[PDB]
Amino acid sequence: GTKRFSIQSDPVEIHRAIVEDGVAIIEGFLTPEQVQKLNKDVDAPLKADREQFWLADFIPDHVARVHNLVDFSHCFRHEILNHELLHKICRLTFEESGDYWLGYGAVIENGPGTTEQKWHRDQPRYPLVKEGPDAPEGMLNFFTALTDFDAETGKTQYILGSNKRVELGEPDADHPIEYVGLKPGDTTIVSGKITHRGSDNRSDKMRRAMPIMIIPSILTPFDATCHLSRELVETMTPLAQKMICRRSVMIPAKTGIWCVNMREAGEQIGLKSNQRAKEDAE
Amino acid sequence: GTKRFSIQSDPVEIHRAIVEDGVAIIEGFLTPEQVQKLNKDVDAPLKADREQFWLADFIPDHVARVHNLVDFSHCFRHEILNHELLHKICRLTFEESGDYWLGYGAVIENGPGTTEQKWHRDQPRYPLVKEGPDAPEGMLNFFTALTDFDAETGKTQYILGSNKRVELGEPDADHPIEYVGLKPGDTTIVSGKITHRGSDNRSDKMRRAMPIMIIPSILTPFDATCHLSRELVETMTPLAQKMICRRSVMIPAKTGIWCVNMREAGEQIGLKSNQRAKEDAE
Numbered sequence: 001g002t003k004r005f006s007i008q009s010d011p012v013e014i015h016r017a018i019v020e021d022g023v024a025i026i027e028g029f030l031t032p033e034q035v036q037k038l039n040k041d042v043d044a045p046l047k048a049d050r051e052q053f054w055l056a057d058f059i060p061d062h063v064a065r066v067h068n069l070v071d072f073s074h075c076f077r078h079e080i081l082n083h084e085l086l087h088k089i090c091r092l093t094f095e096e097s098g099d100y101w102l103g104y105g106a107v108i109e110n111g112p113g114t115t116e117q118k119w120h121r122d123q124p125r126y127p128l129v130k131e132g133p134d135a136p137e138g139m140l141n142f143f144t145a146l147t148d149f150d151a152e153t154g155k156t157q158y159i160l161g162s163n164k165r166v167e168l169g170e171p172d173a174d175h176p177i178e179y180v181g182l183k184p185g186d187t188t189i190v191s192g193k194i195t196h197r198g199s200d201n202r203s204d205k206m207r208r209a210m211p212i213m214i215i216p217s218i219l220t221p222f223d224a225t226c227h228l229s230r231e232l233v234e235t236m237t238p239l240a241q242k243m244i245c246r247r248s249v250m251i252p253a254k255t256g257i258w259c260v261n262m263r264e265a266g267e268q269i270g271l272k273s274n275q276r277a278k279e280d281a282e
Numbered sequence: 283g284t285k286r287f288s289i290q291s292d293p294v295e296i297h298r299a300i301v302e303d304g305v306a307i308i309e310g311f312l313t314p315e316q317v318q319k320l321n322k323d324v325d326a327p328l329k330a331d332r333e334q335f336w337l338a339d340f341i342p343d344h345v346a347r348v349h350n351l352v353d354f355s356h357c358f359r360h361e362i363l364n365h366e367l368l369h370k371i372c373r374l375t376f377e378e379s380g381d382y383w384l385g386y387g388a389v390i391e392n393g394p395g396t397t398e399q400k401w402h403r404d405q406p407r408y409p410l411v412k413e414g415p416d417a418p419e420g421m422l423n424f425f426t427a428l429t430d431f432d433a434e435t436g437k438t439q440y441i442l443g444s445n446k447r448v449e450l451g452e453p454d455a456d457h458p459i460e461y462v463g464l465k466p467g468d469t470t471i472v473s474g475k476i477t478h479r480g481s482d483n484r485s486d487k488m489r490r491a492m493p494i495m496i497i498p499s500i501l502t503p504f505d506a507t508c509h510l511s512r513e514l515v516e517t518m519t520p521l522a523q524k525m526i527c528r529r530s531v532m533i534p535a536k537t538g539i540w541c542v543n544m545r546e547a548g549e550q551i552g553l554k555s556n557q558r559a560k561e562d563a564e
């Protein structure tokens with residue numbers, strides 16, 4: 001089944017598993033303290049969403065979602081966006097296309113009563129973008145548990161082998177379903193090629209996942225970042241600024257795009273980095 | 283040869299010419315007054331560039347370039363980005379991919395001594411993006427003359443028929459070179475599929491072109507717009523804001539991406555539009 005790694009594992013082997021299998025698990029990708037911070041950051045927005053074409057209008061019964069985590073989560077913008085293993089894996093995964101950045105960071109909360117989904121792949125279908133077993137990787141979703149994913153709350157089902165297929169496919173003897181159990185802070189790295197579906201939540205608990213969707217930076221993210229203040233952006237590392245569309249990005253020809261004066265976008269406007277954040281201060 | 287249209291021509295016929303031929307000309311696409319304003323806006327930056335990997339470091343001998351025209355040209359951000367015929371043509375051209383936005387707006391000034399270029403296509407090659415005679419359109423460059431393009435200053439050469447070829451190709455009897463003459467304000471609409479090269483500038487004059495490069499909004503622009511102030515952005519029309527990555531954009535599934543709270547990016551932050559500009563005021 002799906003290879004399970006730790007935070008100390010070789011990114012080369014994690015990348016190999018993603019290429020071969022379409023999916024890999026990192027146990028303890030986040031620490032329990034990080035999980036705690038992230039849950040506290042999204043408690044109020046999730047409660048507000050729940051208490052209520054745009055994709056906001058297509059959220060399934062009993063599911064609440066909150067997007068644009070950079071806007072309001074200190075942990076997300078400083079810890080998650082600088083996650084060293086995430087970056088080692090993404091650099092290898094997207095090497096053919098060049099740099100990568102954040103397609104979106106969100107939390108999805110499946111409440112009791114959430115129903116099993118249809119088989120799908122995560123990658124949007126665009127006429128201009130190559131897709132399929134032999135295409136370059138178009139996305140990686142570090143699908144991170146913030147609560148337990150078990151038999152009751154729902155384990156995501158992956159059709160092993162489906163990353164090699166053109167059609168979504170059905171499980172057979174040689175492509176059985178794996179139901180992936182996760183402890184909070186474990187992540188399943190989901191390629192755009194692997195067929196999967198979430199399960200029923202038939203427990204009494206909220207089941208929360210934080211997709212960290214990474215895409216090649218030649219493609220537009222789902223979550224906009226253009227409204228973020230220069231103040232907030234300047235508290236971030238240069239790497240994390242690059243993940244939110246505030247720095248130039250490299251393409252193989254490497255040369256830069258997303259530029260100012262045909263040069264690096266941040267440097268040309270004097271963009272600072274690593275400045276102290278108001279929320280860390282008294 | 284290349285079909286020549288006017289500002290009153292049917293966009294359906296212009297689009298047909300782009301699909302069939304890979305190139306179309308609109309005479310009087312800009313008015314002489316617009317040409318005058320644009321030239322005055324770029325005079326100082328061009329002089330500064332001339333008086334001197336990133337593409338800034340690969341500009342050919344005797345050529346000066348200035349990018350990011352939205353930042354400093356009132357005419358560009360209010361007149362060009364709202365050009366009604368440009369939009370009718372782009373909506374038809376990019377219908378398979380959804381919405382479109384500004385890949386870059388620049389002025390290229392070929393001084394006396396500028397040499398004929400190598401045959402090329404304008405569209406960057408990315409492993410993930412389909413290219414070729416049968417691929418969806420990946421870019422349209424409204425290559426707009428700001429000075430005369432004639433035998434002396436240099437007419438751009440297009441290999442007629444090359445949009446149907448996989449390789450760049452060479453002119454033959456059935457794919458002859460067309461040298462396109464332009465008066466200031468005439469535009470050649472250049473698809474990403476047509477093989478072409480600029481000519482020598484063997485005159486005593488500066489030869490200026492303003493590429494208005496439009497790309498599907500699923501793709502990242504060459505010119506960043508993330509540093510523009512909310513003040514400046516709020517002076518623009520909602521359409522022009524969309525061209526500079528400040529509004530959500532539609533994809534066929536239509537649904538929106540580049541979102542805030544999975545909804546329209548500007549509306550969610552209360553983005554104003556059509557506000558009076560400081561440079562129009564006393």
Ligand SMILES: O=C(O)CCC(=O)C(=O)O
Nearest residue numbers: 122156196197198199209
């Ligand atoms: O896997 C899940 O439980 C839901 C995440 C997912 O598959 C999706 O919503 O696209």
Ligand SMILES: O=C(O)CCC(=O)C(=O)O
Nearest residue numbers: 404438478479480481491
């Ligand atoms: O056509 C020209 O004269 C120069 C514009 C062009 O072809 C290019 O620089 O890519």
Ligand SMILES: [Fe+2]
Nearest residue numbers: 120121122196
């Ligand atoms: Fe999924």
Ligand SMILES: [Fe+2]
Nearest residue numbers: 402403404478
């Ligand atoms: Fe060109």
Ligand code: NA
Nearest residue numbers: 018019020163
């Ligand atoms: Na693979």
Ligand code: NA
Nearest residue numbers: 300301302445
């Ligand atoms: Na065509």
